[PDB]
Symmetry: D3
Subunit: 117 residues, 6 copies
């Protein structure tokens, strides 16, 4: 699956090839942008508050738990995806790694089985 | 899973043992019959048009894509199944191979999990 | 997954560690109790009749078939689980083995994919 | 896979259907016999010492670890199998559960791949 | 995996796309050729005798059993593969279906793990 | 599995929790060290030449191919592992991501099956 690394403020630092395939942004396009560009509203506007809340409280909601969420492609289409977040440290500052698993195929098979009785 | 081979007009040429188990027709019973006997209406009556449309346009809908569809047993019961279609040539004429995966178990587990809250 | 063994009257004889983790009862707590404590009503009150009906008729409903059912934890929360039942004999009397697979994760992933369009 | 339950002295108390298929002994034949009948020498003669050593020291070698060992069928043929052992208590005495996974297929595929260059 | 269909004399009748990828022969190249071109000697020269022996005796060695064998590519390189054979009838004559699973990756991983201690 | 990120000179920039578990080095201990500390000789001394050779030639040996290699823990024990390498760019410089899959379990099961006939 796809891999993204962000700094303590949600800025994309590293964007894997698979992330380019999934989200539609090239590495140069994605790096330097806030990770919130990869999700729809309301999560998009709230994303910084999610990171800030974790830095303040150290209380995890997805970190070490995982969660299926809605992601957004550059073309504006949305998709279901599983998200796991790793916490790292480099040069005195926090960095977060995001592993993204596209569940579009799963969602469609399930809806199709439901739709066929 | 089950395997069927048809000629360019939808006539069953080869019918595997697993196809006999799934559809309820023996090989001798199935061979020489149109593949449309394995599906309910409206697909059943439209099936020849689907094959003819592909021979004319060469524009695929399931070939090289795959699709979950409703199949029909000889006893008249229907079931969800995944279908993949391979295109072959033998003695100057087109033949199509169909690989069928019975998704009855999957559909029932899913409906049951949904029904139990 | 979890394993439980009961006598011909539904009394728990053996309760695996994994069963302790899933149901919330320790082995000493569970042993000597009727297996009906592991399920909600109406199955709970009917459970003895299910065992008695099998001893009389020898007609199986889950034995050698399997079934997804709702189980109940000691804290009173319910969960979906797959149940397989094995039939054994020891010292002239019937014993039944129950293999339990927790499908909570499966049910939640499915509901979540459905809820996200 | 196969399931066996023994008392604190290695006597078979319960023998699943799958264990009957794998080992070649029927449930009535197996129950009341020492579990050592299911393995070749030298493990066979040493088996009681393995159980006794655990009761004395409480130091596990397979319990909670697992191990691939050589098992023996009634017809005298041997096979590789994975063994996991669960420890239980019933009516003041220890009982042990053995889950057996036949690895014959695995061993043969591996030897065959090795033998074909 | 790859699929091939032969007549009662070992002549290739149908050759799937995946078979073209695995063996190196195109469908037109393969059709009309004996299936023995897909294996090295000594199996190659003996192959007709294997089919003839089955037609005479009806005693199976791979049919309904399966077997890992050495296959051969057009470029002359050999590889390990699993073979399953289905028996069919069409227009009064026997046809055989061969499902081929390339085990090159498996063999190499295994040899590599062995070579690294 | 484990994840490591290095700069264009083999210096560890990010070291995941799973990498800490596998290699035995904490993140602070690993960061700033050359990736060659994670492998035995001769690869260890040659590692810089492997990276330099890729920067010069752009000719891949593991990048986009994968390879099972011998890794080394801090305690000095070695293990078989599968390695996949991703190539990234950040702030005008190349970075490489390494995904490490511990194959110790696989190697031991295989050796054990071989050793038991
Ligand atoms: C692309 C789609 C994504 C969506 C829709 C999403 C959404 C969310 C949500 C709902 C939360 C928790 C808020 C709460 O429940 O109170 C969260 C937290 C967080 N996310 Fe994202 N996220 C996405 C991607 C990412 C990625 C790729 C990373 C890392 C590279 C990341 C880093 C974080 C961090 C560091 C937190 C705070 C820690 C925590 O609450 O566990 N997110 N996000
Ligand atoms: C048994 C249940 C089946 C059902 C319900 C079914 C239904 C369909 C549908 C919906 C289409 C596409 C029409 C469209 O979207 O415009 C199609 C096309 C086609 N099917 Fe079937 N099919 C079945 C089995 C098979 C089998 C077993 C074969 C081959 C042996 C086969 C051969 C073809 C061919 C050659 C086409 C045209 C190519 C294409 O559109 O990709 N079908 N079928
Ligand atoms: C914990 C949740 C469980 C639930 C909700 C449950 C429910 C049921 C149901 C619905 C039936 C069949 C009644 C019918 O369809 O007519 C049944 C039968 C039976 N159950 Fe349970 N069961 C549970 C656990 C167990 C366990 C762990 C065992 C064995 C240790 C067990 C032993 C049996 C036996 C012996 C029968 C009769 C045989 C048969 O009908 O196949 N049950 N149960
Ligand atoms: C059938 C083939 C079997 C073989 C070859 C085998 C062999 C062994 C070996 C090698 C040990 C450890 C001795 C040591 O390393 O010091 C052991 C221990 C033990 N085994 Fe077996 N065993 C078999 C089946 C079983 C089964 C089915 C059970 C339970 C039903 C069982 C119960 C135990 C117990 C309770 C111990 C002592 C606890 C421990 O050392 O972890 N064994 N066995
Ligand atoms: C390409 C590599 C292949 C090799 C090395 C191979 C080798 C063999 C061997 C060793 C036997 C059994 C002889 C014996 O043990 O006495 C056999 C039998 C047979 N094979 Fe092949 N085979 C290959 C492919 C195929 C394919 C693709 C088909 C069908 C399309 C096929 C059809 C048959 C038939 C019909 C028999 C006789 C039935 C039986 O003995 O079970 N073979 N082959
Ligand atoms: C820890 C055990 C490792 C071993 C034994 C190892 C060994 C090797 C070997 C044998 C080569 C290719 C030399 C050749 O065949 O000519 C290579 C190349 C390379 N490795 Fe490592 N490696 C390890 C870990 C890593 C990690 C974790 C990374 C990245 C974070 C990495 C980055 C690279 C790069 C960038 C190349 C050059 C590109 C290429 O040849 O494809 N290595 N390594």
């Amino acid at each position: 699956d796809a891999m993204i690394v962000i700094d303590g403020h949600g800025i994309i630092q590293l964007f894997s090839t698979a992330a380019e395939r999934l989200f539609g942004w090239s590495e140069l396009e994605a790096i330097g942008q806030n990770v919130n560009i990869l999700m729809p509203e309301p999560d998009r506007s709230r994303h910084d508050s999610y990171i800030s809340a974790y830095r303040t409280t150290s209380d995890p909601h997805i970190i070490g738990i995982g969660r299926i969420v809605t992601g957004k492609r550059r073309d504006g289409t949305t998709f279901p995806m599983h998200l796991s977040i790793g916490e790292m440290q480099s040069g005195g500052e926090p960095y977060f790694t995001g592993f993204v698993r596209d569940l579009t195929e799963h969602q469609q098979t399930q809806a199709r089985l439901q739709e066929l009785q």
